[PDB]
Amino acid sequence: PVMVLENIEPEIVYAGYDSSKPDTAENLLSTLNRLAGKQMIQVVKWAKVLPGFKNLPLEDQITLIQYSWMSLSSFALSWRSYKHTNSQFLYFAPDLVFNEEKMHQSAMYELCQGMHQISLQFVRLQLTFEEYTIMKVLLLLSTIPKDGLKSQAAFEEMRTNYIKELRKMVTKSGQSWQRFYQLTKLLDSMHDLVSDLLEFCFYTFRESHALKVEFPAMLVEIISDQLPKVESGNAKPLYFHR
Amino acid sequence: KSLLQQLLTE
Numbered sequence: 739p740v741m742v743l744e745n746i747e748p749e750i751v752y753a754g755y756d757s758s759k760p761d762t763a764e765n766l767l768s769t770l771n772r773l774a775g776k777q778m779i780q781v782v783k784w785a786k787v788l789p790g791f792k793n794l795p796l797e798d799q800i801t802l803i804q805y806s807w808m809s810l811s812s813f814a815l816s817w818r819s820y821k822h823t824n825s826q827f828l829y830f831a832p833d834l835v836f837n838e839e840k841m842h843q844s845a846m847y848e849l850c851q852g853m854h855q856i857s858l859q860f861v862r863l864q865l866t867f868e869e870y871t872i873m874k875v876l877l878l879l880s881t882i883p884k885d886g887l888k889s890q891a892a893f894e895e896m897r898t899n900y901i902k903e904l905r906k907m908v909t910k911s912g913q914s915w916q917r918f919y920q921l922t923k924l925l926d927s928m929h930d931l932v933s934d935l936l937e938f939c940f941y942t943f944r945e946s947h948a949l950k951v952e953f954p955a956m957l958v959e960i961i962s963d964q965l966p967k968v969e970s971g972n973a974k975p976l977y978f979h980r
Numbered sequence: 981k982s983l984l985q986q987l988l989t990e
């Protein structure tokens with residue numbers, strides 16, 4: 739599956755950001771949401787051809803993408819931050835890199851700091867691309883409905899196979915045992931982060947009109963379905979620890 | 981047909 743993940747890995751997406759324009763929160767947040775829309779088209783194309791995922795019913799595929807989109811987006815952001823800047827900045831796109839200054843102007847400074855902490859962890863662990871690609875699949879399968887999916891057994895089989903796949907990757911001991919522990923603790927830490935990101939996302943989505951924070955059609959459809967489920971307690975995060 | 985539906989059933 740590791741060779742498959744390397745080939746289907748989505749190419750970098752440009753924000754189309756103009757650096758000579760004013761750094762207002764409305765402009766910054768709207769640019770990032772339009773970027774999220776373009777990135778998510780690739781994410782869904784990547785998901786569609788994943789070994790095992792293609793065997794889940796379409797309704798379970800939609801549920802998993804709607805629950806995990808924020809986690810996949812933040813994890814990929816930290817991956818680019820690590821690979822292009824050695825986790826000094828938040829590399830949203832090649833033409834949109836956040837420093838402390840942009841973080842303050844985006845009106846989401848603490849959440850940016852929270853997303854930066856994950857990039858810092860990637861530098862500390864010296865995360866490999868192979869480890870990253872399996873962890874991304876585990877994030878796609880990290881949240882399910884409270885009453886489970888339509889094909890819960892098929893889901894559990896796929897997820898166990900990807901956990902085993904991560905164990906096989908780190909065994910390439912002692913250090914490999916500590917690595918599996920550290921990579922799975924890092925996966926669980928995404929739940930707390932994503933909970934805070936979605937809180938601000940849901941607020942800006944509700945207050946889109948007053949705030950003038952644009953959302954592309956891709957994000958409107960996902961958030962319209964996701965928001966009622968999360969807010970009513972229908973989401974069930976899956977943890978490796980606790 | 982939603983955008984997620986379209987992209988998963990191409």
Ligand SMILES: C[C@@H]1C[C@H]2[C@@H]3CCC4=CC(=O)C=C[C@]4(C)[C@@]3(F)[C@@H](O)C[C@]2(C)[C@@]1(O)C(=O)CO
Binds near residue numbers: 935
């Ligand atoms: C705090 C939230 C979390 C944000 C997201 C965090 C993860 C992310 C990484 C990217 O590479 C591009 C866009 C996204 C996916 C994002 F940066 C934007 O979409 C804006 C976002 C939703 C947010 O700032 C808003 O709600 C703005 O409305």
